[PDB]
Amino acid sequence: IDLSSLRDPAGIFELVEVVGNGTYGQVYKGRHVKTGQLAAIKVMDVTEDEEEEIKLEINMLKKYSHHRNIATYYGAFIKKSPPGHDDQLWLVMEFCGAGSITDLVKNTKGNTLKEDWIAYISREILRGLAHLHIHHVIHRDIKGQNVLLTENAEVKLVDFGNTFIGTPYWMAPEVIACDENPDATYDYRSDLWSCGITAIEMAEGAPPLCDMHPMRALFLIPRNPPPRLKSKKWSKKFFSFIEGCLVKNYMQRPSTEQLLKHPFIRDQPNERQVRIQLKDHIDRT
Numbered sequence: 001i002d003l004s005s006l007r008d009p010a011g012i013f014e015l016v017e018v019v020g021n022g023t024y025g026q027v028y029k030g031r032h033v034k035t036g037q038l039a040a041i042k043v044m045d046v047t048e049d050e051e052e053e054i055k056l057e058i059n060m061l062k063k064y065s066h067h068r069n070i071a072t073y074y075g076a077f078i079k080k081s082p083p084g085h086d087d088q089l090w091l092v093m094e095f096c097g098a099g100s101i102t103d104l105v106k107n108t109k110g111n112t113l114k115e116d117w118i119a120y121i122s123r124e125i126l127r128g129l130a131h132l133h134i135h136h137v138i139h140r141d142i143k144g145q146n147v148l149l150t151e152n153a154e155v156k157l158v159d160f161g162n163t164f165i166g167t168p169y170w171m172a173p174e175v176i177a178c179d180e181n182p183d184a185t186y187d188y189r190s191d192l193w194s195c196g197i198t199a200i201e202m203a204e205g206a207p208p209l210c211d212m213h214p215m216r217a218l219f220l221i222p223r224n225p226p227p228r229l230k231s232k233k234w235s236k237k238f239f240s241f242i243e244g245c246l247v248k249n250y251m252q253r254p255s256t257e258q259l260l261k262h263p264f265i266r267d268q269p270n271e272r273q274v275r276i277q278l279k280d281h282i283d284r285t
């Protein structure tokens with residue numbers, strides 16, 4: 001519970017290459033020197049003022065990241081610099097080598113996923129969310145990019161809640177301020193909307209207003225009726241789940257616990273086979 005104990009990462013971790021493209025920023029594929037073991041290393045410049053806002057970031061990952069549907073925290077390191085600034089802070093976590101769900105859709109023929117795959121991943125997203133929510137934590141950024149796979153087909157979450165506004169596509173209507181929603185408040189239920197959009201992403205290859213300029217999409221999310229699956233091919237349980245996820249008014253939107261009982265998530269006989277199916281796609285590196 002102090003930045004002084006934090007070792008120099010020197011003979012402990014090596015930075016191999018920047019992970020993904022630059023999707024996550026300064027997140028690197030790291031190597032544990034001694035074991036050769038892989039870790040994901042998040043690098044950040046740290047000032048004398050950033051010292052207390054960062055002590056919590058570490059404690060968040062320490063407390064909450066010890067669930068199977070959350071990428072495990074390993075440790076923290078400071079790469080010191082001369083008295084004329086600026087120290088680097090390395091947040092070492094589990095390296096989910098199979099990439100993200102975005103990678104999965106892009107790597108899958110025709111950029112669509114099998115319905116039973118959506119059911120599997122969505123259950124694991126919800127199961128991870130249930131953990132954050134039960135600990136009074138809102139993820140704030142549920143999307144394909146932020147849902148990763150291990151080489152063991154385990155579904156794991158990243159990026160739970162500085163100057164910029166990011167991508168609008170997965171934002172629940174309530175988090176976007178307009179005339180009747182002036183103080184736009186994040187609810188636990190916002191992560192459920194985002195989850196529903198992630199399921200559309202998994203189904204169609206991209207989220208509902210991907211073709212719009214981000215500013216135009218930001219404007220449309222609170223005005224447009226709930227997004228719907230384009231195809232009619234989908235099962236009744238799937239449209240139903242998307243519907244439940246995408247209740248426009250958060251006040252009637254179901255809890256993460258209620259969703260976990262939805263027939264699409266609850267009823268999964270191919271669960272074991274799907275995990276094997278996903279493992280083989282991963283094996284095709």
Ligand SMILES: CS(=O)(=O)c1ccc(-c2cc(-c3ccc(O)cc3)cnc2N)cc1
Binds near residue numbers: 024040093098
């Ligand atoms: C805390 S954060 O900055 O949001 C963050 C967010 C994500 C990761 C992370 C990314 C990857 C990864 C992604 C794509 C790919 O192609 C290959 C690998 C694997 N494991 C991870 N833990 C790490 C920190």
